[PDB]
Amino acid sequence: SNAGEVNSFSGYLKLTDNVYIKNADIVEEAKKVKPTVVVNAANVYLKHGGGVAGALNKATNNAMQVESDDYIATNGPLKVGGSCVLSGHNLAKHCLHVVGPNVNKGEDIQLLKSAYENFNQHEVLLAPLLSAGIFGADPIHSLRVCVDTVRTNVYLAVFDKNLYDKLVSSFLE
């Protein structure tokens, strides 16, 4: 890897005492920062074909999917709102696979609070906005649940510049 120190976050905007945000690609952030923990936007079967999960898995050259398939065959699926800790491969020491509700598929948005409570077992995390994208939840709402629920230090990477700008505007109202 590059020779930088681990957990080297740069250029984030501090929103609260423990929540930070950056307009960035989470894969490029993982490579630059070398965090202890990267959060995956997982589904219950740990099938990483799409969304953030697909980007993370591709950046591990499919090692994340191989490990996840081995895990599920023995250990069974996660629950919505739940998490597991598997290897971070080349991206991080650990990957916290967190299942936000998929409101495009009828799941209860209330489970987003449970989803973010998984972050509180880790002192500092690189993460995407939970339940965004293929999961269908309103990103402004997801940021509010994050701020209200996470107590540990979270560094959120949002790649779409227009969505970033709307999140920051929303939060500063």
Contacting residues toward ligand HBD, per CB under 6 A = 6, 34-36, 92-93
Q: Of 67, 111, 109, whose CA–CA distance to 89 is shortest?
A: 67
Please give the single-letter amino acid code of residue 76: G
Indicate the length of the chain as a whole number. 173
- Please report how close the Cβ of residue 105 comes to ligand HBD at its closest, in angstroms: 33
Are 146 and 125 a contacting pair, CB within 8 Å? no
Q: How far apart are CA 67 and CA 49, in angstroms?
A: 14
- Please report how close the Cβ of residue 92 comes to ligand HBD at its closest, in angstroms: 5
Query: Residue 36 or 152: which CB sits closer to ligand HBD?
Result: 36
Cβ-closest residue to ligand HBD? 34
Query: Residue 18 or 36: which CB sits closer to ligand HBD?
Result: 36
Query: Residue 35 or 100: which CB sits closer to ligand HBD?
Result: 35
- Please report how close the Cβ of residue 55 comes to ligand HBD at its closest, in angstroms: 17
Which residue in this structure is represented by tokens 């701020």? 147
Half-sphere exposure at residue 135, Cβ-oriented, CA atoms within 13 angstroms: 30
Q: Name the maximum alpha-carbon separation found in the chain.
A: 47
- Please report how close the Cβ of residue 30 comes to ligand HBD at its closest, in angstroms: 8
Query: Residue 15 or 30: which CB sits closer to ligand HBD?
Result: 30
- Please report how close the Cβ of residue 8 comes to ligand HBD at its closest, in angstroms: 10
Please give the single-letter amino acid code of residue 149: T
Q: Of 38, 44, 151, 15, whose CA–CA distance to 85 is shortest?
A: 38
Query: Residue 6 or 66: which CB sits closer to ligand HBD?
Result: 6
